[PDB]
Amino acid sequence: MRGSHHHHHHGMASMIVVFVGTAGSGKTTLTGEFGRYLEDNYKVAYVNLDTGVKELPYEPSIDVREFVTVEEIMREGYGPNGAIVESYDRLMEKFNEYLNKILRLEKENDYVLIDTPGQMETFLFHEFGVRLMENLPYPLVVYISDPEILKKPNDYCFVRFFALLIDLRLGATTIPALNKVDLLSEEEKERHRKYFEDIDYLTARLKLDPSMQGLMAYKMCSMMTEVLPPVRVLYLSAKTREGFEDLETLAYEHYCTCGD
Amino acid sequence: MRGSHHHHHHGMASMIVVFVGTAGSGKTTLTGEFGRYLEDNYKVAYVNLDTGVKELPYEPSIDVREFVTVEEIMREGYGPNGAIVESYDRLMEKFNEYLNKILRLEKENDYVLIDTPGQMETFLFHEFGVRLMENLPYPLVVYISDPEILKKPNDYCFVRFFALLIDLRLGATTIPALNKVDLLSEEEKERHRKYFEDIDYLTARLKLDPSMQGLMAYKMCSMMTEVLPPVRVLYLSAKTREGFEDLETLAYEHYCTCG
Ligand SMILES: Nc1nc2c(ncn2[C@@H]2O[C@H](COP(=O)(O)OP(=O)(O)O)[C@@H](O)[C@H]2O)c(=O)[nH]1
Ligand SMILES: Nc1nc2c(ncn2[C@@H]2O[C@H](COP(=O)(O)OP(=O)(O)O)[C@@H](O)[C@H]2O)c(=O)[nH]1
Ligand SMILES: [Mg+2]
Ligand SMILES: [Mg+2]
Ligand SMILES: [Mg+2]
């Protein structure tokens, strides 16, 4: 039950799940709702690494906003993007303190869910995100996309290649995911399934496009197949809980694979 | 000699240069300063596509802030990241207006410099930026990085492949560049240059990393070597004008190759 005080055998490895995605893709909604789903059976901790957000739908165990917020920095004269970068520059003076706090959490909880800066570039291109990721034990990254971006074959290539680049940059296993699938018709869902998950098939379709862009997509997609095995993809809805069972399975499978 | 009024030959294709990079990398600084550089000889127009910035170092011919700002949206109750996205959703309703204004500038100026949203993901992951790029004549994208992100061998891989991804996404020739190189010691400068300019050296360095991510970069870099020849990385300073001569030459060469 959610109201149970679940016990974690201290030091028994936890599952650290890190949600990453462009601003508005659903990281925060997913963090809260997936955590609520897990709370029935597991001891869950939440980490908020976003300095921007006004209201969280979960109760954070760690909340970087207690140190500084973007809104506070803007009151000092910064523009919003200037303030975002500055908030993470300032947060770096507390890096070891936050890192150590998260490590403590991983020892005391079954799951640690980490909700990242609202702009994924703040997480990928700032030392704070990079250094954190380097120092966590086998975190699982779930990279969520908004299906609205996926209109033509080349778009599927773009999103899958981006996921590979996140893996490269963060040095962590990255699961490509769609969020907001509740907004999709069954016809829409099937189209996405055709192109988004089967890379051999996507590659084949890109090969048919004789244009410069198609050629490029075909080369990148083909390289991707050789640089990365198959990989399971997720179709999630942070609103309806669609795909949560799938995510939970993948996390447990990653858990088992790690530490062997 | 800011008082010059250079003439552009009507019927003459302009050069469109688009600056893209993560927040804080120097897009706005570079736009203004490279513009000021070009203004010695050319009729230059500036397009600001960023809804967030409070003050520009150049005078924009087109400025999306006249329609809406992130700050205005925040006054409505939005947090900053919610407001950034909302700003572009609102602008999209006026896409044709802005596309058409930019197309007009391109007929009337030698150079049109486009300063993109402060957050690169707004440009690459929002309809506004990708639909704009699809509709511009042979734009040159300059993708700038802060040298401070180049901490290890795999970072060089990352930058090269990120530029490739941008080229795919935007369908435009993308030049990778470092900005802020004025901040670099002479050793730092040569190290970066070594990894970017000596692909086999880079790949060999990647080989030594026994980490699980080591092998990936290794595998990739070596496949890039094969199928997608490494484009020359530019070294710029928006502060000191380092690299500006190089950028202007590449822009003209791209222009010639496109005409
Ligand atoms: N329909 C739908 N809306 C969602 C879903 N997940 C998030 N949202 C909405 O998308 C907006 C952005 O969500 P948020 O979690 O703040 O995105 P973040 O910036 O990635 O943290 C909010 O209005 C959410 O209610 C989903 O699965 N389905
Ligand atoms: N030292 C140095 N600082 C720079 C350079 N270019 C930009 N900056 C500074 O970096 C910060 C962010 O620059 P800005 O142009 O606003 O970046 P943007 O968000 O990409 O548009 C500002 O303080 C600039 O003064 C450069 O070439 N050298
Ligand atoms: Mg969020
Ligand atoms: Mg700003
Ligand atoms: Mg700017």
State the DSSP string of B11-40. Answer: T-PPEEEEEEESTTSSHHHHHHHHHHHHTT
Nearest Cα neighbor of B145 from B111, B187, B195 is: B195
Cα Dmax for chain A: 60
Is B164's CB within 8 Å of A220's CB? Answer: yes
Please name the residue that has the structure tokens 């507390």.
A94
> Resolution limit in angstroms?
1.8
**Cβ contacts of A57 on chain B, cutoff 8 Å:** none
Beta carbon of A182 within 6 Å of any ligand 1 atom? yes
CB B255 within 8 A of CB B13: yes
Amino acid making up residue A160? R
Secondary structure of A99-133 as H, E, C letters: HHHHHHHHHHCCEEEEECCCCHHHHHHCHHHHHHH
Please name the residue that has the structure tokens 């500038």.
B105
Amino acid making up residue A243? G
CB atoms within 10 A of CB B49: 25
Helix (H) or strand (E) holding B176, with range, is strand B173-178
CB B217 within 8 A of CB B155: no
Beta carbon of B148 within 6 Å of any ligand 2 atom? no
The whole-angstrom separation of Cα A24 and Cα A22 is 6
CA of A24 to the centre of ligand 1 (A): 6
Which class in CATH covers the domain with range B1-258?
alpha beta
Query: To probe the interface with B, which of A54, A72, A121, A219 has the most B CB atoms within 10 Å?
Result: A121
Bridging pattern class, strands B111-115 and A15-21: unpaired
Helix spans in chain A (H): 27-39, 70-75, 80-91, 95-108, 120-125, 127-135, 153-170, 186-196, 199-207, 212-227, 244-257
Beta strands across the sheet bearing A62-63: A62-63, A44-48, A111-115, A15-21, A140-145, A173-178, A234-235
Beta carbon of A153 within 6 Å of any ligand 1 atom? no
B74: contact with A, CB 8 A cutoff: yes
Tokens representing A10 are: 């201290």
CB B17 within 8 A of CB B83: no
Cα distances (angstroms) measured from residue B103 to each of B9, B22, B44, B134: 16, 26, 14, 12
DSSP state of A224: H
On the CB side of B50, CA atoms within 13 Å amount to 29
CB A46 within 8 A of CB A31: yes
Is A53's CB within 8 Å of B81's CB? Answer: yes
Residue A141 bridge partners (DSSP): A18, A174
Bridging pattern class, strands B173-178 and B44-48: unpaired
Q: What is the dihedral of CA B48, A21, A198, A187, to 10 degrees?
A: -80
Q: What is the dihedral of CA A168, A170, A171, A173, to 10 degrees?
A: -90
**Chain A window 139-178: which residues touch B at a Cβ cutoff of 8 Å?**
146, 149, 154, 157-158, 161-162, 165, 167-169, 171
User: What are the DSSP E strand ranges found in B102-156?
Assistant: 111-115, 140-145
Determine the Cα angle at A133 with ends A130 and A136, to 5°: 155
Q: Which atom of ligand 2 is nearest to the CA of B238?
A: 27
CA of B146 to the centre of ligand 2 (A): 9
Query: To probe the interface with B, which of A119, A135, A149 has the most B CB atoms within 10 Å?
Result: A119
The residues, ordered by sequence, that sit 6+ positions from B120 with a Cβ below 8 Å of its Cβ are A121, B20, B21, B22, B23
CB B154 within 8 A of CB B65: no
Burial of residue A77 (CB within 10 Å: 0-12, 13-18, 19+) is exposed
CA of B117 to the centre of ligand 5 (A): 7
Among all bound ligands, the one having the nearest atom to the CA of A244 is 1
On the CB side of A87, CA atoms within 13 Å amount to 32
Cα Dmax for chain B: 59
The whole-angstrom separation of Cα B185 and Cα B200 is 24
CB A13 within 8 A of CB A80: no
Cα distances (angstroms) measured from residue B52 to each of B66, B88, B222: 11, 11, 40
Burial B211-243 (b: 16+ CB within 10 A, else e): eebbebbbbbbbbbeeebebbebbbbbbeeebb
Q: Whose CA is nearest to atom 14 of ligand 1?
A: A26
The whole-angstrom separation of Cα A139 and Cα B254 is 43
On the CB side of A181, CA atoms within 13 Å amount to 21
Is B24's CB within 8 Å of A171's CB? Answer: no
A62 alpha carbon, distance to own chain's centre: 17
The whole-angstrom separation of Cα A138 and Cα A171 is 9
CB atoms within 10 A of CB B97: 11
Beta strands across the sheet bearing B140-145: B62-63, B44-48, B111-115, B15-21, B140-145, B173-178, B234-235
Technique used by the depositors: X-ray
B57: contact with A, CB 8 A cutoff: no
CB B171 within 8 A of CB B46: no
Please name the residue that has the structure tokens 């469109």.
B16
The whole-angstrom separation of Cα B103 and Cα B105 is 6
Is A168's CB within 8 Å of B118's CB? Answer: no
CB B49 within 8 A of CB B145: no
**Cβ contacts of A22 on chain B, cutoff 8 Å:** 121, 125
| Domain parsing of chain A, residue ranges | 1-258
A137: contact with B, CB 8 A cutoff: no
